[PDB]
């Protein structure tokens, strides 16, 4: 007639990326980054086109896109109201991730090179942490973007004041305090493609403070590092087998050698050692056909193999490897594998961090340094 389940003795007490991001599609998640592409990591230069309308030299008209924005927003609202009116998932194609539609905000970073950084196509949430005032409080100061949550226990290193609302980017990679600023009155946003220039205005720009890392960047030559390289190569090989049209499912080796050119012999073809067999006689010659007993994994199994956040941690590791390599122990402490290990260990309560040090990304007294100190 009651509960009668002794639950207090048995049980004592989210981010959805785009379908191009969870499927690790090449443009957005690169297979190989060279040295000049690792120096320009997250700072991509303005490339000159060889073919297209902008490849011909001369003046080029920019095109306003406000009929396009409101047409796409009205179309997405029709899709949402036709599907029952709830919240929908829209980012299903690469053409959904253009800047030509939707409400764009900008997000500037305080640090030069953060320990973790999102790739194109990945999602993040805005959480407004609001500590109520002692006793009576009016309610969270309302904010245009994000959802509000009442935080008794401060997520960040410091603690919120009573009656202080702090917005923050929250995802699987990090959590970082963001501060809304209005845009300058002179700056517009030009989206250039091969066909022409397009212009939006911006009105909202956030400044992102020092990140609190939630994912540990692996070290170089680590076991997690080599495991991610092997799993990424295996996922790319499976997706090339899925894309193959000729049954018995066959791929070419120099497609994989074009994708992963730093990979040597054994390494790149130890994933072709299993699942594939080198047909070189008669038909399918010089192809790696799929074995007939091998069941090619489904889409959800391939998604469960490698996560996009592991790819971002690997990209952070190899970019920091390049920067350290170019600059000939203080710098090694500022490497993201050390700082991410230090911060995550401090969050479990293993150890403490010297908050003033050399891992400080500001170079002055502002900002923290995530390097381990003993709790003694």
């Amino acid at each position: 007639p009651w509960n009668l389940s002794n639950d207090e003795y048995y049980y004592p007490k989210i981010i959805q990326h785009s379908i191009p991001a969870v499927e690790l599609r090449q443009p957005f998640f690169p297979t190989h980054m060279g040295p000049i592409k690792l120096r320009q990591f997250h700072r991509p230069p303005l490339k000159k086109y060889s073919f297209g309308a902008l490849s011909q030299p001369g003046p080029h008209s920019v095109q306003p896109l406000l009929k396009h924005i409101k047409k796409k927003a009205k179309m997405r609202e029709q899709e949402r109201q036709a599907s029952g009116g709830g919240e929908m998932f829209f980012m299903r194609t690469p053409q959904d991730l253009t800047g030509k539609d939707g409400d764009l905000i900008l997000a500037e970073y305080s640090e030069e090179n953060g320990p973790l950084m999102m790739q194109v196509g990945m999602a993040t949430k805005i959480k407004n942490y609001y500590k109520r005032k002692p006793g009576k409080d009016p309610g969270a100061p309302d904010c245009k973007y994000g959802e509000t949550v009442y935080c008794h226990t401060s997520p960040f290193l410091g603690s919120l004041h009573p009656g202080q609302l702090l917005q923050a980017f929250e995802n699987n990679l990090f959590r970082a305090p963001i501060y809304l600023h209005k845009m300058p009155e002179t700056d517009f946003l030009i989206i250039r493609t091969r066909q022409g220039y397009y212009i939006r205005e911006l009105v909202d720009i956030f400044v992102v403070g020092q990140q609190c890392p939630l994912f540990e960047v692996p070290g170089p030559n680590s076991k997690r590092a080599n495991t991610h390289i092997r799993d990424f190569l295996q996922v790319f090989i499976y997706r090339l087998f899925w894309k193959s049209k000729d049954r018995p499912r066959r791929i070419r080796m120099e497609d994989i050698k074009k994708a992963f050119p730093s990979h040597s012999e054994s390494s790149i073809r130890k994933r072709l050692k299993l699942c594939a067999d080198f047909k070189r006689t008669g038909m399918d010659s010089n192809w790696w056909v799929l074995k007939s007993d091998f069941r090619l994994p489904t889409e959800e199994e391939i998604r469960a193999m490698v996560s996009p956040e592991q790819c971002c941690a690997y990209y952070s590791m190899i970019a920091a490897e390049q920067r350290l390599k170019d600059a000939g122990d203080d710098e090694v402490r500022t490497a993201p594998w050390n700082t991410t290990r230090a911060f995550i260990a401090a969050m479990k309560g293993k150890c403490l961090l010297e908050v003033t040090g050399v891992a400080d990304p500001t170079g002055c007294g502002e900002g923290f340094s995530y390097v381990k100190i003993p709790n003694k």
Partner: protein, 963 residues
């Protein structure tokens, strides 16, 4: 997209019933349908009608000609000498498909008059006025007329519409499909002292000009199918719900306080189902009718539910409150997702049954706790795997035979066996739990809200189906709505667990590699059994090592056998630290039984029941004891209890005794540990040291501190030590000595529990505890030592059994003067007399049970007595008792009793196909073939039960014992 199989579209139907005669069991009425032809040259219109005598039919007030033929009255010809069951199953499927309204067909074929052909070619409205009469219906609408004198309201006579699925053709002519939605107008002219309850809202109630009868007018503006239209006419006591005011509860006279107490919880069920879904209750009223001699225990129609009165309990009745509570809950779940959103075909029934069962399981989770939810899910999964390994498999969503491994056709609901229908609903709600496991619960509730919101925007239009078919769900529409809200499609999961009809069997064994610190699992599947299929997906395994609980995902492809997973340290055995559990807590474990070289404490293959599986894991006995003690999952504690019966070591006795002593364990685990401890105690006789098992524990928990053999006076206010107290002597009576006879220390203990029982002080009744005491007395009976087939008389009775017989005589006679709640002690004493007759103690005479199986008794007494007669005619090979049972199947007033007799005679058959018996004549084959062909033609559940009985007795081929 829904395209009708009918060439017309039905818009509105008026059902008027006059002259409900209770003495003659007769109704008169008419039916007026408003159809729009969709194809020109409509000519014949085919409607559904059974048992109604059609007087006249007028189309647009012009006299029309009809022809009636029902091929399902006599399925095969009388002069065909076929006697195999595959012939009858194909002929019965063809006969049901020939009256199917889901094809274009129907039983009543009306011919459109000639002058209306220019009205039908350019597609204009046709109004068909049939007037009919039910003369004395067999299973159409049930007349319960008691034989007390007085007026029909003074004796308590009532009518209700009984049947399952499309059975509204049995009391008025209609288009009896779930896809023909129309609006309704229902008038019933009943006696002035009676009330007529039906679907819709009651717009008025006018008197007749003599003021001796009154007409109830109902209107249903939400477009429902004909199959969801019901009726209950009787002298009901009306009770408006004091919390929700559109909900009226109707009971039989003198049962108003039971109705007040019983239906006082229902507003919380309404609030739950309207806050997990975000739609309000779609109908404008809700009516719960409690009746006598019900067809099923709970039936749900549009804006109405019909329960039996045997669910009504008072405030002092426990062990019946959760069962009635969950019957109300599943009736409301079917109100949301069986009556508002309806089916598009007979396929896509798994969608509706799965959504109903799944949201009812969510209600059970919130109400009775997650632990009761896990226990319920595990018992449903064990039920399905037992049924699918027993016979073939349940196929949700077949494609039109698709399932030829069984003996009936799955094309229509009225050819299904009743056990297949039950397992169909069970598998549908477990597959919906699997879809929730792949796509999270909030997205699942968003799917259900999107279906309900499409249906409720559809439900307010007036266009005749230009939008009323958005109230019908299909499989493709359900998967498309899932893909709309989530972006993932479930087509591999749908292809494996819906379209394929099988469960999987896992055999696991591990080995710990000490050198490389790995755990080598070995999981092999039995995929060559008749009910099984091969699993190739991922598989979760949970390993509890000394460093904590870790989950691993294994990829089990066809050629896979050995899975190497890594193991952690064993540094919590260097220092004594607490070992962290599956939840956030940590406990002190006694690590003396553990191996020195392995850190792992237990392994669980598929802990979350994420596949439809049967696991056979080979752990060591100390791992099963650690999993019984320190696990924070009730299904793992239950499976460790189930696996400790093979290890009768005293450490397992200590484990189960520590589980039994432990409050803050879930009570249904301790109730299982009682029976496991009884089995282990029976297996380690000539090793057992002290007293019998659980006796000292019973005197420690439930008896006085100063008197060990006097039980404490009954205070049943804890509801967990009440269940444990009433289940512990029942397991304690299974204690077996070296001579194989129950010890006289446990029998004397049970008799002292019976004598010193005082219930004048608790606020709850004692009927279930005393009934379990009779069950414990029946468990102690060992077979008697008859010499030279000596006649069992009173002098050569066992000295043990004379005390038992005196106690059950006292209990049954005191029940004759002071009755229990549902004659629970009558049922227990009849069961115990059958136990004493099954051994050589009481003479094997069925006359007592034949007197308790008469019509005027309570239905629980009737089914207990008929179970005893079925067991007697199995053991004594009685011909006249089998003819008695078959006669009672043919002509009994209560159809639930007929279905139960066929069910019990299928479960405990008098002979199987392998047996040579004296009861395998050509006469019995001819009787059972006549019972399948004719005789059971009026119920659709007796005919499937007769098909099941013929399959159990004679098999799928020609009866062998025949010329």
């Amino acid at each position: 997209g829904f395209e009708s199989p009918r060439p017309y579209k039905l818009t509105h139907q008026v059902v008027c019933i006059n002259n409900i005669n209770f003495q003659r069991k007769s109704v008169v009425g008419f039916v007026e349908l408003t159809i729009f032809p969709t194809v020109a040259n409509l000519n014949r219109i085919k409607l559904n009608s059974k048992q109604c005598r059609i007087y006249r039919v007028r189309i647009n007030d012009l006299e029309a000609a009809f022809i009636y033929n029902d091929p399902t009255l006599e399925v095969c010809h009388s002069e065909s000498k076929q006697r195999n069951l595959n012939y009858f199953s194909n002929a019965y499927a063809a006969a049901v498909s020939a009256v199917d309204p889901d094809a274009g067909n129907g039983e009543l074929c009306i011919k459109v008059p000639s002058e209306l052909w220019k009205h039908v070619d350019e597609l204009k409205v046709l109004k068909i006025h049939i007037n009919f009469s039910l003369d004395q219906p067999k299973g159409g609408l049930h007349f319960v007329v008691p034989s007390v004198e007085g007026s029909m309201a003074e004796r308590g006579a009532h009518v209700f519409s009984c049947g399952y699925q499309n059975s509204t053709r049995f009391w008025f002519p209609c288009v009896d499909s779930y896809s023909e939605l129309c609006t309704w107008k229902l008038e019933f002219t009943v006696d002035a002292a009676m009330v007529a309850v039906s679907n819709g809202d009651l717009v008025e109630t006018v008197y007749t000009h003599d003021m001796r009868k009154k007409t109830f007018h109902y209107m249903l503006t939400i477009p429902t199918a004909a199959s969801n239209i019901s009726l209950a006419i009787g002298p009901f006591e009306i009770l408006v719900d004091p919390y929700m005011h559109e909900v009226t509860h109707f009971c039989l006279p003198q049962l108003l306080p039971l109705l007040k107490h019983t239906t006082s919880y229902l507003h919380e069920v309404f609030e739950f189902y309207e806050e997990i879904l975000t739609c309000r209750y779609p109908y404008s009223c809700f009516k719960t009718v409690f009746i006598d001699e019900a067809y099923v225990e709970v039936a749900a129609y549009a804006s109405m539910s019909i329960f039996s009165t045997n669910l009504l309990h008072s405030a002092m009745i426990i062990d019946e409150t959760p069962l009635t509570r969950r019957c109300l809950a599943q009736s409301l779940a079917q109100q949301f997702f069986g009556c508002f959103i309806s089916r598009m075909s007979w396929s896509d029934e798994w969608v509706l049954k799965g959504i109903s069962g799944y949201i009812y399981g969510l209600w059970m989770k919130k109400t009775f706790g997650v632990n009761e939810y896990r226990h319920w899910i595990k018992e449903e999964l064990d039920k399905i795997v037992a049924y699918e390994l027993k016979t073939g498999g349940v196929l949700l969503h077949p494609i039109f035979n698709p399932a030829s491994h069984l003996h009936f056709s799955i094309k229509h609901p009225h050819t299904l066996s009743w056990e297949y229908y039950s397992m169909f609903q069970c598998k549908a709600h477990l597959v919906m739990r699997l879809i929730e496991n792949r796509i999270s619960m909030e997205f699942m509730l968003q799917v259900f809200n999107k279906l309900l919101s499409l249906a409720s925007t559809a439900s307010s239009q007036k266009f005749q189906s230009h939008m009323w078919s958005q109230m019908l769900v299909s499989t493709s529409g359900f998967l498309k709505s899932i893909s709309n809200v989530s972006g993932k499609d479930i087509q591999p999961l749908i292809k494996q667990w819906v379209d394929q009809s099988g469960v999987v069997k896992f055999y696991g064994s591990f080995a710990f590699n000490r050198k490389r610190n790995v755990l080598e699992l070995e999981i092999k599947q039995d995929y060559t059994s008749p009910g099984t299929q091969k699993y190739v997906g991922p598989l979760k395994v949970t390993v509890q090592e000394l460093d904590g609980s870790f989950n691993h995902t294994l990829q089990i492809e066809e050629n896979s056998l050995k899975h190497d997973i890594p193991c952690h340290s064993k540094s919590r055995r260097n220092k004594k630290k607490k070992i962290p559990l599956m939840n956030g807590e940590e406990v002190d474990m006694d690590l003396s039984a553990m191996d020195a070289d392995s850190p792992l404490l237990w392994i669980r293959i598929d802990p979350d029941m994420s596949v439809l599986r049967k696991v056979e894991f080979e752990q060591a006995d100390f791992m099963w004891q650690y999993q019984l003690r320190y696990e924070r999952d009730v299904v793992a504690q239950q499976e460790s209890i189930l696996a400790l019966e093979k290890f009768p070591t005293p450490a397992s006795r200590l484990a189960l005794t520590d589980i039994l002593e432990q409050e803050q364990c879930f009570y249904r685990v301790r109730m299982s540990a009682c029976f496991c401890l009884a089995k282990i105690a029976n297996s380690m006789v000539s090793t057992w040291t002290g007293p019998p098992a659980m006796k000292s524990l019973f005197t420690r928990m439930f008896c006085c501190k100063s008197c060990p053999n006097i039980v404490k006076t009954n205070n049943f206010m804890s509801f967990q030590s009440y269940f444990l107290q009433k289940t512990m002597p029942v397991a304690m009576a299974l204690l077996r000595d070296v001579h194989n006879l129950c010890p006289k220390e446990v029998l004397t203990f049970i008799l002292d529990l019976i004598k010193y029982n005082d219930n004048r002080k608790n606020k709850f009744s004692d009927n279930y505890y005393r009934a379990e005491m009779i069950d414990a007395l029946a468990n102690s009976v060992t077979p008697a030592v008859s010499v030279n087939n000596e006649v069992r008389t009173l002098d050569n009775l066992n000295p043990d059994v004379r005390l038992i017989l005196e106690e059950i005589t006292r209990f049954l006679n005191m029940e004759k003067l002071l009755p229990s709640y549902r004659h629970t002690i009558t049922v227990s004493c009849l069961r115990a007399i059958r136990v004493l007759q099954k051994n050589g103690h009481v003479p094997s005479d069925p006359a007592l049970f034949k007197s308790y199986a008469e019509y005027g008794h309570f239905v629980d007494i009737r089914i207990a007595a008929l179970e005893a007669v079925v067991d007697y005619t199995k053991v004594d090979r009685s011909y006249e008792e089998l003819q008695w049972l078959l006669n009672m199947i043919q002509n009994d007033p209560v159809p639930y009793v007929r279905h139960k007799i066929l069910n019990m005679l299928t479960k405990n058959p008098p002979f199987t196909k392998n047996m040579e018996s004296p009861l395998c004549n050509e006469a019995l084959v001819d009787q059972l073939w006549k019972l399948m062909n004719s005789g059971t033609s009026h119920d659709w559940r007796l005919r499937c039960g007769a098909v099941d009985l013929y399959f159990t007795l004679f098999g799928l081929s020609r009866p062998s014992c025949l010329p």
